[PDB]
Design a protein around this ligand. Structure first.
Ligand SMILES: *[C@H](CC(=O)N1C(=O)C=C(OC)[C@@H]1Cc1ccccc1)[C@H](C)NC(=O)[C@H](CC(C)C)NC(=O)[C@H](CC(C)C)OC(=O)[C@H](Cc1ccccc1)N(C)C
Ligand code: NA
Length: 254
């Protein structure tokens, strides 16, 4: 396949409303579960030609996956996509939308940036319990609201392989190393210049582009719309910046 010089999943599949939705993980290390349910929502819609047009529940995966790690204390991508294949994930919107089977219990907060939400601060919530119960107004039983995948895989640590995966099958989840300067990001094309490691972050890659000859990935963060470029950031593409090309995971419904 010829790879275009830029690609935006939001523009290829505009009927799939999840693709342009920015979420907020709140005071919780649930990034691993947000990048997962976001990319699964997108891919469920894209691969079903818009038939499965849903917002999958971050709290269902976060609270119920026994193999994914430590809930609000952080997690692992492979087992999140295996959970989607094996048990599936119910629907559920943000806390403020309170739509679907299991909406997120935690409110929007600012992640080391200025804006109109309360600051996240340094304390995290306890991981919610696995309740397996749809909100009272939702009239599908929990187990009947499950959306499943067929396959999950790691994507090759190769720029062109990742571009082909995104443009054919949809946004992907990806891990990268967070250095302190990432917390100062306001706009433009991120690269690590200053600061020590703060650990790992999991995000959603939706496309790519080039500006002033600088190639980038276009990424949806889960820190609400006030963070970065209306909730998005760009990061140098092609040099495995912060290991962005080395921890890509996704999956298919068919
Ligand atoms: C999401 C990322 C996140 O919440 N972050 C940041 O990256 C920067 C932040 O500051 C606002 C937030 C807040 C934060 C909240 C709780 C803890 C730490 C920071 C989460 C935390 N990241 C992950 O889940 C990560 C995803 C990968 C890249 C796919 N994985 C991990 O962090 C693993 C989780 C274990 C295996 C369960 O752990 C590590 O990578 C460890 C840290 C660790 C070790 C033992 C128990 C818990 C965490 N490393 C030493 C980096
Ligand atoms: Na901003």
């Amino acid at each position: 396949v010829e790879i275009p010089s830029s690609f935006d999943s939001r523009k290829k599949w505009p009927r799939c409303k999840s693709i342009a939705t920015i979420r907020d993980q709140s005071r919780c290390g649930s990034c691993w579960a947000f990048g997962a349910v976001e990319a699964m929502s997108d891919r469920s819609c894209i691969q079903s030609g818009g038939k499965q047009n849903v917002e999958l529940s971050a709290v269902d995966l976060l609270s119920c996956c026994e193999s994914c790690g430590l809930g609000c204390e952080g997690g692992i991508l492979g087992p999140a996509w295996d959970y989607w294949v094996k048990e599936g994930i119910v629907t559920g919107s943000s806390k403020e939308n309170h739509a679907g089977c299991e909406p997120y219990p935690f409110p929007k907060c600012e992640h080391h940036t200025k804006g109109k939400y309360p600051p996240c601060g340094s304390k995290i919530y306890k991981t919610p319990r696995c309740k397996q119960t749809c909100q009272k107004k939702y009239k599908t039983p929990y187990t009947q609201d499950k959306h499943r995948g067929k396959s999950s895989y790691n994507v090759k640590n190769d720029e062109k392989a990742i571009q082909k995966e995104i443009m054919k099958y949809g946004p992907v989840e990806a891990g990268f190393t967070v250095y302190e300067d990432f917390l100062n990001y306001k706009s433009g094309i991120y690269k690590h210049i200053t600061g020590e490691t703060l650990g790992g972050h999991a995000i959603r890659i939706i496309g790519w582009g080039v500006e002033n000859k600088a190639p980038y990935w276009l990424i949806a963060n889960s820190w609400n719309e006030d963070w970065g470029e209306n909730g998005y950031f760009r990061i140098v593409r092609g040099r495995d910046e912060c290991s962005i090309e080395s921890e890509v995971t996704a999956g298919r419904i068919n």
